[PDB]
Amino acid sequence: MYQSKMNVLNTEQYGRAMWQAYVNDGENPNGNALGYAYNWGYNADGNPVL
């Protein structure tokens, strides 16, 4: 049996990671052009939240 199964991102986790990368770079996450559409805003401190 295969025990050392590497944990890779699922679809939702992949979308969340790409959104995080886009907002950290300051680019528009909706410009990902991979079919993801993000509803996101900011918290009190101004940090982006998804």
Partner 1 sequence: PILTQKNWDGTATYFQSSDEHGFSMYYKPQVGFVGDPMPFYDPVAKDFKVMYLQDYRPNPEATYHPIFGVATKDGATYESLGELISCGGRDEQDAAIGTGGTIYNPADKLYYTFYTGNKFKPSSDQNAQVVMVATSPDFKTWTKNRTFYLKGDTYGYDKNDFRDPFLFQTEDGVYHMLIATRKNGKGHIAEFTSADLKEWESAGTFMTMMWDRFYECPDVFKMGDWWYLIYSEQASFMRKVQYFKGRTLEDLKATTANDAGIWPDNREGMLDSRAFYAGKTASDGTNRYIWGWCPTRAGNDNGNVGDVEPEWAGNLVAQRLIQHEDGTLTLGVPDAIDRKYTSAQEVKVMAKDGNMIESGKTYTLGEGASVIFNRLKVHNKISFTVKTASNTDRFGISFVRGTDSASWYSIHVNADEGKANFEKDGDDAKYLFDNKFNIPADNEYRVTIYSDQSVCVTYINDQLSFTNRIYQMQKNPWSLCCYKGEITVSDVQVSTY
Partner 2 sequence: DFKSGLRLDGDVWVNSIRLDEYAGTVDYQNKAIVVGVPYDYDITRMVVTEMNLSEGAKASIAIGETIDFSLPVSLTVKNGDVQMSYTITVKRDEA
- 6 makes contact, choosing from partner 1, partner 2, none, with CB < 5 to 8 Å by partner type, with none
Dihedral class, residue 7 (left if φ above 0, else alpha if ψ from -120 to 50, else beta): beta
- 7 or 47: CB nearest partner 1: 47
Task: Answer yes or no: are the C-beta atoms of 29 and 39 closer than 8 Å.
Answer: no
Does residue number 34 form part of the binding site for partner 1 (CB under 8 A)? no
Which lies closer to partner 2 via its Cβ, residue 7 or residue 24?
7
Q: Should residue 11 be labelled a site residue for partner 2 when binding is judged by CB under 8 A?
A: yes
In the chain, DSSP assigns E strands to 41-42, 48-49
